[PDB]
Amino acid sequence: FVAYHRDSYENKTMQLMPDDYSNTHSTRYVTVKETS
């Protein structure tokens, strides 16, 4: 089983972005910032 994000390729070192502020405590860092 697998769920490729996009282009069906994999094993890519994607960085984490500071994202946008959501809650006064959470400091979330995301990557993205019949598909899957």
Partner: protein, 49 residues
């Protein structure tokens, strides 16, 4: 004159009770009483939102 006067007044001087302004003692502030809970409802509702 030059004559001694008998001192026969038995002194009863009862100092009055001095006034006391009682403080409103605060043991735990509102911040401590709000932080004493593991589960804060407001934070949970903000996370759900």
């Amino acid at each position: 004159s030059s004559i001694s006067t008998v001192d026969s007044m038995i002194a009863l001087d009862i100092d009055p009770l001095e006034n006391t302004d009682f403080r409103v003692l605060e043991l735990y502030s509102q911040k401590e009483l709000r932080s004493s809970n593991v589960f804060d409802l407001e934070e949970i509702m903000r996370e759900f939102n």
